[PDB]
């Protein structure tokens, strides 16, 4: 009755950051030892909580957020961070309690053709609130004239495509990021360690 952490990390495909996937984990036993002791992670940063002391505590729910970003944008997946990813794609609250796990995925998500179907939000009039998902594909009106659905002057498509190429630098290489969030509400607990 172990929690399906393999589904999130050992996933064949990953979602774009603007349409980040979240898997609700509950009513299972979470064995973190199979996760935190792996040496395949480039960054394993935890805030507010310590993974070595998770096999003894309990939580009502656990969330795992999956997306693909650039190496330069892994810095933005952190509380109190600003940037295109942090403001318009995926925002973490300043009081975040959890971990952000990122590993390089150049072998998986890169193509010599110089393009891929990974997208991020480039234009947005206001920043995202924490744990907010905007999957709009409507033309961004940068002026006062209505866009009428056709891209043009002062009317741009809000999304942009990563140019993931195997020859790019480490900063440009695609990274797969999984964000573990722990929820504690006044309710029966459903996720406990071994």
């Amino acid at each position: 009755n172990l929690c399906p952490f393999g589904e999130v990390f050992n996933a064949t495909r990953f979602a774009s950051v603007y349409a980040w996937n979240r898997k609700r984990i509950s009513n299972c036993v979470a064995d973190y030892s199979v996760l935190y002791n792996s040496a395949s992670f480039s960054t394993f940063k935890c805030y507010g909580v310590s993974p070595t002391k998770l096999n003894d505590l309990c939580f009502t729910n656990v969330y795992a957020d999956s997306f693909v970003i650039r190496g330069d944008e892994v810095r933005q997946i952190a509380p109190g961070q600003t940037g295109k990813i942090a403001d318009y794609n995926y925002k973490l609250p300043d009081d975040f309690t959890g971990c952000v796990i990122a590993w390089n995925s150049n072998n998986l998500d890169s193509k010599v053709g110089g393009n891929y179907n990974y997208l991020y939000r480039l234009f947005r009039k206001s920043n995202l609130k924490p744990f907010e998902r905007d999957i709009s594909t409507e033309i961004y009106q940068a002026g006062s004239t209505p866009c009428n659905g056709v891209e043009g002057f002062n009317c741009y498509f809000p999304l942009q495509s990563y140019g993931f190429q195997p020859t790019n630098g480490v900063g440009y290489q695609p990274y797969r990021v999984v964000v573990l969030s722990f929820e504690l509400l006044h309710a029966p607990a459903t996720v406990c360690g071994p």
């Epitope: 002791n37 940063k45 935890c46 310590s50 971990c99």
Partner: antibody, heavy 119, light 114 residues
Framework: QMQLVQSGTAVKKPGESLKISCKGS????????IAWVRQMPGKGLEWMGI????????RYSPSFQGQVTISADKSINTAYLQWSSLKASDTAIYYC????????????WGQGTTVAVSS | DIQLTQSPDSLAVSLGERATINCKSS????????????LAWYQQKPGQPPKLLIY???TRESGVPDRFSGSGSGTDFALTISSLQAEDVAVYYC?????????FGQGTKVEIKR
């Protein structure tokens, strides 16, 4: 299940350069953050800064920002504390502490490194 | 820069009695408002590296004897050692880890009474 080992005792003249070592060994060093604590002889513990070996994120206390540099080498799981111009005030024992995340208690501690600036 | 001041500086308690160390916080130390105060208590025997005793203001570290207990909330916190023994002679520091400038207390020397 993780342990920390520091470098040996250093005796230096004022104005010299120093760089002390702190290497970790255990299961889960990837999640651990390393911080440096200064304890002057007969004094209490002073927190200087913390660094994450994975991405080398250096957070400094305002009292030690421009006077010391904290680095790390994730290849060898080692953190470094470096002085350019040693002063007589820097004569103290330095501990590196282990914490598996920012804003987490420090579980693993090193045996300490003794630094003596005396001329 | 959260200031931590602990009292008394020196404490003299006989064997088998209770020793209490209070720690006062300049600002509240709580993260995510989860009713968890981010404070720690450390024990430093003479000539030895500090050892963590209590984290999150009430939780004992693995192997810590039951005579150690943490208490407090807000800005007032205390560490109590019931039935003080000879091996508990050390200097105790209260350290907060809820903000980037980690802060220690000035320390509390503990000695047996005679």
């Amino acid at each position: 299940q993780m342990q920390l080992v520091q470098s040996g005792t250093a005796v230096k003249k004022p104005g010299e350069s120093l760089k002390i070592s702190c290497k970790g060994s255990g299961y889960g060093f990837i999640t651990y953050w390393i911080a440096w604590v200064r304890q002057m002889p007969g004094k209490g513990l002073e927190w200087m800064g913390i660094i994450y070996p994975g991405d080398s994120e250096t957070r400094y206390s305002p009292s030690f920002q421009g006077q010391v540099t904290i680095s790390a080498d994730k290849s060898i799981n080692t953190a470094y504390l470096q002085w350019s111009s040693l002063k007589a005030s820097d004569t103290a024992i330095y501990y590196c502490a282990g914490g598996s995340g920012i804003f987490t208690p420090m579980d693993v501690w090193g045996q300490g490194t003794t630094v003596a600036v005396s001329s | 820069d959260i200031q931590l001041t602990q009292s008394p500086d020196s404490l003299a308690v006989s064997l088998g009695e209770r020793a209490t160390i209070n720690c006062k916080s300049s600002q509240s130390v709580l993260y995510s408002s989860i009713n968890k105060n981010y404070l720690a208590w450390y024990q430093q025997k003479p000539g030895q590296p500090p050892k963590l005793l209590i984290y999150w203001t009430s939780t004992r570290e693995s192997g810590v004897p039951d005579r150690f207990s943490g208490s407090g909330s807000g800005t007032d916190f205390a560490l109590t050692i019931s039935s003080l023994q000879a091996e508990d002679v050390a200097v105790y520091y209260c350290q907060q880890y809820s903000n980037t400038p980690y802060t220690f207390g000035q320390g509390t020397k503990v000695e047996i009474k005679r």
